Design a protein around this ligand. Structure first.
Ligand SMILES: *C(=O)c1nc(NC(=O)Nc2cc(O[C@H](C)c3c(Cl)cncc3Cl)c(C#N)cn2)c(OCCN2CCOCC2)cc1CN1CCN(C)CC1=O
Length: 299
């Protein structure tokens, strides 16, 4: 096999694999029960997410998974990222064991929590009150900014930051996922639509799309798209615009409109994140500060 790294190796027989969660370009993720993830409580159960190779896996798929494992080892721990818990490399298939986020991704979290429509009959004293409030939406944005600030401090560029790549825990903690990934940036099919209808090109900064240049400031552009997703309660960006039209609109400097029920403070931050010049966009540290000021004011 690969060499044994005792810092991270976890006995595979302490895992009970459960129902799949999803599949990526290289790898599939399944939920699992782990026993004794904390060695001081060797019989204690926890729920984890296990990434492994697909059945049709190539050598490149394996190298990609090994690279992701090594990034996750070096990233260190932060509240607002999916953290590595362990690996299984010996005497069996390669597993990368990560935190599981029980509420799924932020896009599905928001879409399932949109406020009741005008067609519902009032029933009780809170018929108009949906699950989502403005301070909680701001906190979601602030937590993503804090996770990105951490990743940036560890020299990690995400390259596809989007609400679907932010996961939500049982306690509504945002955790950035899939930050350590080979994404085939020199062979992106810009017209590709996912099985859920997503066009990932809509999150790419112009220097990434047109020039294949990625920096932390290209992640800031994507964060602005993510902010728009938050304040549309999981809307899809550039509504109605196919990829061919997107290319021409971006060349003309088009930006998304201010969404309904979005204060100008938040649309202002979106527009700063989409400034054409990467040096004219805020840094993640500045976004953390700006969002914290709003969060404190409204809390
Ligand atoms: C464990 O806490 C857990 N997790 C989920 N959902 C989930 O997405 N967990 C998750 C996924 C994940 O990466 C995958 C590939 C992914 C997916 Cl599936 C979607 N978008 C992006 C990504 Cl990147 C990682 C990593 N790294 C970590 N965690 C879960 O589900 C619930 C189903 N439901 C959720 C809301 O949206 C629709 C689906 C359930 C659980 C553990 N739980 C909790 C509740 N019990 C009752 C059942 C259960 O299994």
């Amino acid at each position: 096999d690969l060499p044994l790294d005792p810092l991270w190796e976890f006995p595979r027989d302490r895992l009970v694999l459960g129902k799949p969660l999803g599949e990526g370009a290289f790898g599939q993720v399944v939920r699992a029960e782990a026993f004794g993830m904390d060695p001081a409580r060797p019989d204690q159960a926890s729920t984890v997410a296990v990434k492994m190779l697909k059945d049709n896996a190539s050598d490149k798929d394996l190298a990609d998974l090994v690279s992701e494992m090594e990034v996750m080892k070096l990233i260190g721990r932060h509240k607002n990222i999916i953290n590595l818990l362990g690996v299984c490399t010996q005497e069996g298939p390669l597993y990368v064991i990560l935190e599981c986020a029980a509420k799924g991704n932020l896009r599905e979290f928001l879409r399932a929590r949109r406020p009741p429509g005008p067609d519902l009959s009032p029933d009780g004293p809170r018929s108009s009150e949906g699950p989502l409030s403005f301070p909680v939406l701001v906190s979601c944005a602030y937590q993503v900014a804090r996770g990105m600030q951490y990743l940036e401090s560890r020299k990690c560029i995400h390259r596809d930051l989007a609400a679907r790549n932010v996961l939500v825990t049982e306690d509504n903690v945002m955790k950035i996922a899939d930050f350590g990934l080979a994404r085939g940036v020199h062979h992106i099919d810009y017209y590709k639509k996912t099985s859920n209808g997503r066009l990932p090109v809509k999150w790419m900064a112009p220097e990434a799309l047109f020039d294949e240049v990625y920096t932390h400031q290209s992640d800031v552009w994507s964060f602005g798209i993510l902010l728009w997703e938050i304040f549309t309660l999981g809307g899809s960006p550039y509504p109605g615009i196919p990829v061919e039209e997107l290319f021409s609109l971006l060349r003309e400097g088009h930006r998304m409109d201010r969404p309904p029920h979005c204060p100008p403070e938040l649309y202002g931050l979106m527009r700063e994140c989409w400034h054409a010049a990467p040096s004219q966009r805020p840094t993640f540290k500045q976004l953390v500060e700006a969002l914290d000021k709003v969060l404190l004011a409204v809390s």
